[PDB]
Amino acid sequence: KEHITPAEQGEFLAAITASSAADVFDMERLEILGNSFLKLSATLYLASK
């Protein structure tokens, strides 16, 4: 837990903003890691259940 870091507000702003809105920052890089996490969690949940 010592390496825990605050969930930065700018990070959520990047998550909420899509690529359509031509902003300097977007969601894809966070989206990839989120996709991997979702797949992992789905697999583990289903197997355990």
Partner 1 sequence: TATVNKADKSKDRTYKTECPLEFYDALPRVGEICYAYEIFLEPQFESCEYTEHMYLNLQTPRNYAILLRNKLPRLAEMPLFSNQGKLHVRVANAPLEVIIQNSEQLELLHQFHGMVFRDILKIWHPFFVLDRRSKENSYLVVPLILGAGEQKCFDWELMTNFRRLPQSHGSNVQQREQQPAPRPEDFEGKIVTQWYANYDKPMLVTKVHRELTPLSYMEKNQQDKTYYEFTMSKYGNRIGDVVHKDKFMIEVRDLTEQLTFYVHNRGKFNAKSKAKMKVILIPELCFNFNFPGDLWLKLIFLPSILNRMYFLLHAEALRKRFNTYLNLHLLPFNGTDYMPRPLEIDYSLKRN
Partner 2 sequence: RFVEGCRANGQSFYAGADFSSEVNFCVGLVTIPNKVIADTLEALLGVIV
Binding mask 6-25 for partner 1 (x = CB under 8 A): xxxxx-xxxxxx----xxxx
Per CB under 8 A, which of residues 1..49 are in contact with partner 2?
7, 11-12, 14-16, 18-20, 27-28, 30-38
Residue 38 CA from chain centroid, whole number: 9
- Per partner kind, with CB cut-offs from 5 to 8 A, the member of partner 1, partner 2, none near residue 23 is partner 1
All residues at 6 or more sequence positions from 31 whose CB lies less than 8 Å from its CB, including other chains? none
Question: Which residues sit at the interface with partner 2, rule CB under 8 A?
Answer: 7, 11-12, 14-16, 18-20, 27-28, 30-38
